[PDB]
Amino acid sequence: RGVNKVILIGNLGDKPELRYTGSGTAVCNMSLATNETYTDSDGNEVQNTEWHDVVAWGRLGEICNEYLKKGSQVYFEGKLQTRSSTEVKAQEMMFLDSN
Amino acid sequence: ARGVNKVILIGNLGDKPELRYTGSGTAVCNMSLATNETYTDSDGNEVQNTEWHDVVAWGRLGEICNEYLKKGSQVYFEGKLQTSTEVKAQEMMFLDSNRQ
DNA sequence: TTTTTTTT
DNA sequence: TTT
User: Fold this and answer.
1) Which keywords does this Swiss-Prot/TrEMBL entry list (chain A) (predicted)?
2) Which of A3, A10, A81 is closest, CB to CB, to B3?
3) CB contact burial A33-64 (16+ within 10 A = b; e otherwise)
4) CA atoms of B75 and B55, how far apart (whole Å)
5) φ and ψ at B52, to 5 degrees?
């Protein structure tokens, strides 16, 4: 009855932080920086870093906590949602950090 | 691009769009959009999940939103996340126009 | 806080 | 669905 999709490509601001709920469900909280770089009206470069709170639950949360490092380039697809603040609940994750 | 920040929403406004102007006279339109999701309970019961989103449209797009959108209007939005967290609308489609 | 009409 |  509705579409709620978010797509993010950027780098992690810090190591993923894995926690567990009272019910023992894995929750992984992450900060992703998407960088927009644009020259403005006076030919002056301006860098505008957007920070995003990304949340991964269950297996995906633990996979993220295992393989993702501070500064890792990563693709995320998920839902927009607000809880407790506004966050992206990850549904898909793709490593873009290969060598 | 040095990054990808893309948001896509289909939903219904919860209220009339609200348009205001900045000190520079630039049109700013704020909206509240709802995306509904329905699933089944542990007991198999229907359970509605609703997410509300603050959507902002600037300039001409902001005026077009204020001009055609109303309470309950079904609408497609496409934009970027900005953080208070907001979806800045870059693209909009009125979905209650050509339904059949 | 507030939205949803045939239909998954 | 869920810190």
Assistant:
1) DNA damage, DNA recombination, DNA repair, DNA replication, DNA-binding
2) A10
3) ebeeeeeeeeeeeeeeebebebbbeeebbbbb
4) 11
5) -105, 140
Rounded, the Å distance between the CA of A99 and C1' of C2 is 49
Phi, psi dihedral angles at A62 (to 5 degrees): -80, -35
Tokens 């996340």 found at: B81
Residue range of the domain that includes A45: 1-99
Residue B59, sorted as left (phi over 0), alpha (psi -120 to 50) or beta, turns out to be: left
CB burial of residue A97 (10 Å; 0-12, 13-18, 19+): middle
Q: How many folded domains does chain B comprise? A: 1
What tokens appear for B18 in the block? 């609200």
Of B5, B8, B38, which has the smallest distance from its Cβ to A34's Cβ? B5
Nominal resolution in Å? 2.5
Please count the CA atoms within 13 angstroms of the CA of B86 that sit on its side-chain side: 12
Phi-psi region of B60 (alpha: psi -120 to 50; beta: other; left: phi over 0): alpha
Contact of A48 with A72, CB cutoff 8 Å? no
Q: How far apart are CA A80 and CA B8, in angstroms?
A: 10
CATH number of the domain residue B43 falls in: 2.40.50.140
Find the chain B residues whose C-beta atoms sit closer than 8 A to any C-beta of A: 1-12, 34-38, 51-53, 76, 80-83, 85, 87
